[PDB]
């Protein structure tokens, strides 16, 4: 399997979903699907460039250069574990950024903790991961769904819904979030018509059946609480197309969906009215400058880039598509920054600041790695990381609590019709530390 290498005195690992998860037919081979941009190439590229900026910043880790080993998770548990094994055999991997998904992160954490390797996630939101007896070497730069689910329960109350349906994605994210939503909503007098679950990669038939099952609760249960992966919502949408059910349901979705266009593209009419929750994360300015200048002929250090470029533009590079890649192709056309970019970048910084701090205490008057950090002791790195206190890429303070969690907040999107045949995500409200505010 392909890997992205950056040399250094210290090597940080990372798992990003450079390709989609395998299909039912190629699962056991663990042959992954198509190359991903926002969730893959962009995060890979973020990783490499953040490391450059840190290595160029003399305030942070002076005379030490951070290198990395970036690996493909395919958003899949087998693939991520396989790849995590490559991290632990046995120059060492000091800590790992990612992976994206709660149940995948858990599987990864189960391996890493046996090797005292701190792991810092940027999108794994499940409450389960707050348990430090079970997941001691796991931390994250996002809040847990104790709050997200709370926000979803609060949106239901605000709009005066007492009767809803529930769908969650199979696996720890959906399962655990929906548990929280089911519990909170029962105390607050909200009835759940039925709770359904489905895997994001189920066939059209499974989704069709789920859609028919949801119609049986019409007209009372037209709102569907979806603690769902983006690809589960898309499945629901496409099933609505096949069954001609556009305008029957209002989907209330969690962060798997947020403001993701790949979820709704091609299926806007069936999604319109949708309410989604997004974790507050501003664009990082300096990412686009770097990224939109990248060229397939000279971006060798990212070994998936040529594959991605050819996919994006549907062309062959003069280094199977029916055309050749034009010289004037640029990413600035239709560019959309990954909604979680700031989290990725902040996760990478936590690791660096964790390392820098350790260095200051264990190497008090020395420049670089002194014997006491040769080699780095994971248990002390975790102590250092657990006391994370810094200013983020976007100017917020990033701090960890005793559970390895981080404060955050949410934007509430409505997916609106903005005029004939044109739809978009519109910020309509927010949720922060218990307070819902709508426009």
Ligand X SMILES: N[C@@H](CCC(=O)O)C(=O)O
Residues that bind its own copies (CB under 8 A): 24-25, 27-28, 77-78, 81-82, 85, 107, 110-111, 113-114, 133, 136
Output 241-245 pairs: Cβ under 8 A, ≥24 positions apart: 241/267, 241/270, 242/204, 242/208, 243/208, 243/211, 243/212, 245/211, 245/215, 245/270
* Helix and strand counts by DSSP (H, E) for the chain: 13, 16
Residue 216 engages ligand NAG in binding (rule: CB under 6 A): no
- What is the nearest approach in angstroms of Mg ion to the Cβ of residue 111? 16
Q: Are strands 275-279 and 163-169 parallel, antiparallel or unpaired?
A: unpaired
Which residues 398-417 are close enough to bind ligand NAG by CB under 6 A? 399
Which residues 50-109 are close enough to bind Mg ion by CB under 5 A? 55, 57, 60-61
Closer residue to Mg ion (CB): 52 or 417: 52
Residue 389 engages ligand NAG in binding (rule: CB under 6 A): yes
Closer residue to ligand NAG (CB): 336 or 360: 360
> From CA 405, how far away is CA 148, in angstroms rounded?
14
Residue 255 touches which of its own copies, ligand NAG, ligand X, none (CB < 5 to 8 A by kind)? ligand X
> From CA 89, how far away is CA 85, in angstroms rounded?
7
Closer residue to ligand X (CB): 77 or 102: 102
Binding residues: 39, 102, 123-125, 173, 255, 340
Token pair, residue 54, equals 């840190």
DSSP state of 41: I
- What is the Cα gyration radius of the chain? 22
Residue 61 touches which of Mg ion, ligand X, its own copies, none (CB < 5 to 8 A by kind)? Mg ion
Q: Are strands 410-417 and 275-279 parallel, antiparallel or unpaired?
A: antiparallel
Interface contacts to ligand X, rule CB under 6 A? 100-102, 123-126, 173, 229-230, 255-256, 340
Residue 433 touches which of its own copies, Mg ion, ligand NAG, none (CB < 5 to 8 A by kind)? none
> From CA 119, how far away is CA 113, in angstroms rounded?
9
> From CA 353, how far away is CA 52, in angstroms rounded?
15
- What is the nearest approach in angstroms of its own copies to the Cβ of residue 27? 5
Residue 102 touches which of Mg ion, ligand NAG, its own copies, none (CB < 5 to 8 A by kind)? none
Residue 311 touches which of ligand X, its own copies, Mg ion, none (CB < 5 to 8 A by kind)? none
Closer residue to ligand X (CB): 113 or 126: 126
Which residues 398-427 are close enough to bind Mg ion by CB under 5 A? 404-405
> From CA 164, how far away is CA 221, in angstroms rounded?
5
Environment class of residue 333 by beta-carbon count within 10 Å: exposed (0-12), middle (13-18) or buried (19+)? exposed
Q: Summarize as ranges the residues that interact with ligand NAG (CB under 6 A).
A: 389, 399
Q: Summarize as ranges the residues that interact with Mg ion (CB under 5 A).
A: 55, 57, 60-61, 129, 140, 404-405
């Amino acid at each position: 399997r392909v890997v992205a290498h950056m040399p250094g005195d210290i090597i940080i690992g990372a798992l990003f979903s450079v390709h989609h998860q395998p299909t039912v037919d190629k699962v056991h081979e663990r042959k992954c699907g198509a190359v991903r941009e926002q969730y893959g190439i962009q995060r890979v590229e973020a990783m490499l460039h953040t490391l450059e900026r840190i290595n160029s910043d003399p305030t942070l880790l002076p005379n030490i250069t951070l290198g990395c080993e970036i690996r493909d998770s395919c958003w899949h548990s087998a693939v991520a574990l396989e790849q995590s094994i490559e991290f632990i055999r046995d120059k060492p991997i000091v800590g790992v950024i990612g992976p994206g998904s709660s149940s995948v992160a858990i599987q990864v954490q189960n391996l890493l903790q046996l090797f005292n390797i701190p792991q810092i996630a940027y999108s794994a939101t499940s409450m389960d991961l707050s348990d430090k007896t079970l997941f001691k070497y796991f931390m994250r730069v996002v809040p847990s769904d104790a709050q997200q689910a709370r926000a979803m329960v609060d949106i239901v109350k605000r709009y005066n819904w007492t009767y809803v349906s529930a769908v969650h994605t199979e696996g720890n994210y959906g399962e655990s979030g929906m548990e929280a939503f089911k519990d909170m909503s029962a105390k607050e007098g909200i009835s759940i018509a039925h709770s359904y679950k489905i895997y994001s990669n189920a066939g059209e038939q499974s989704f069709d059946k789920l859609l028919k099952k949801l119609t049986s609760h019409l007209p009372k249960a037209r709102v569907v609480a979806c603690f769902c992966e983006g690809m589960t919502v898309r499945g629901l949408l496409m099933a609505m197309r096949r069954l001609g059910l556009a305008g029957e349901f209002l989907l209330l979705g969690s962060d798997g969906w947020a403001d993701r266009y790949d979820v709704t593209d091609g299926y806007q009419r069936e999604a319109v009215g949708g309410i989604t929750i997004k974790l507050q994360s501003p664009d990082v300015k300096w990412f686009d400058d770097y990224y939109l200048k990248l060229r397939p002929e000279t971006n060798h250090r990212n070994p998936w880039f040529q594959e991605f470029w050819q996919h994006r533009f549907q062309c062959r590079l003069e280094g199977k598509y029916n055309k050749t890649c034009n010289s004037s192709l640029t990413l600035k056309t239709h560019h959309v920054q990954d909604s979680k970019m700031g989290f990725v970048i902040n996760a990478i910084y936590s690791m660096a600041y964790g390392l820098h701090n350790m260095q200051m205490s264990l190497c008090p008057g020395y420049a670089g790695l002194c014997d006491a950090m040769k080699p780095i002791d994971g248990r002390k790195l975790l102590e250092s990381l657990m006391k994370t206190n810094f200013t983020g890429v976007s100017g917020d303070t990033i701090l960890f609590d005793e559970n390895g969690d981080s404060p955050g907040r949410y934007e509430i999107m409505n997916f609106k019709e903005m005029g004939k045949d044109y739809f978009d995500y519109i910020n309509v409200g927010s949720w922060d530390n218990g307070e819902l505010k709508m426009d």
